[PDB]
Design a protein around this ligand. Structure first.
Ligand SMILES: [Cl-]
Ligand SMILES: [Cl-]
Ligand SMILES: [Cl-]
Ligand SMILES: [Cl-]
Ligand code: NA
Length: 129
């Protein structure tokens, strides 16, 4: 599934991400836009043996089990397959755990490169939330 921008914003809001751990909702929409282009099945393989999964490109070394990554900790206790679902529930549940590390949203490459420090409220412009 490829989410619409405000479609995704609404779902993220329903799941409590607005201002979670100090990140207003637009940070999360921006992260999804630039990590995955809002695609729930986005998957990117890294040379390090890990894979980034789903709309938020969550990495398989520390957060989900794909059965093939070195240093696996599976701290969200889920198959990485769950992070490829068309609904965002597993990805948001896991994201709340990831952002609770001292890293915060720096865990997301694309957030660090295209969202941090910007006008992230623009990503929820015209969403009526
Ligand atoms: Cl939902
Ligand atoms: Cl915002
Ligand atoms: Cl899996
Ligand atoms: Cl990570
Ligand atoms: Na990632």
């Amino acid at each position: 599934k490829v989410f619409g921008r405000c479609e995704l914003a609404a779902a993220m809001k329903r799941h409590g991400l607005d201002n979670y751990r100090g990140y207003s909702l637009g940070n999360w929409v921006c992260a999804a836009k630039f990590e995955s282009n809002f695609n729930t099945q986005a998957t990117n393989r890294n040379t390090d043996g890990s894979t980034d999964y789903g709309i938020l490109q969550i990495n398989s070394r520390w957060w989900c089990n794909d059965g093939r990554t070195p240093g696996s900790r599976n701290l969200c206790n889920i198959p990485c397959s769950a992070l490829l679902s068309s609904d965002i529930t597993a990805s948001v549940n896991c994201a709340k755990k990831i952002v609770s590390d001292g890293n915060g949203m720096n865990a997301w490459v694309a957030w660090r490169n295209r969202c941090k420090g910007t006008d992230v409220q623009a990503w929820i412009r015209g969403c009526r939330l």
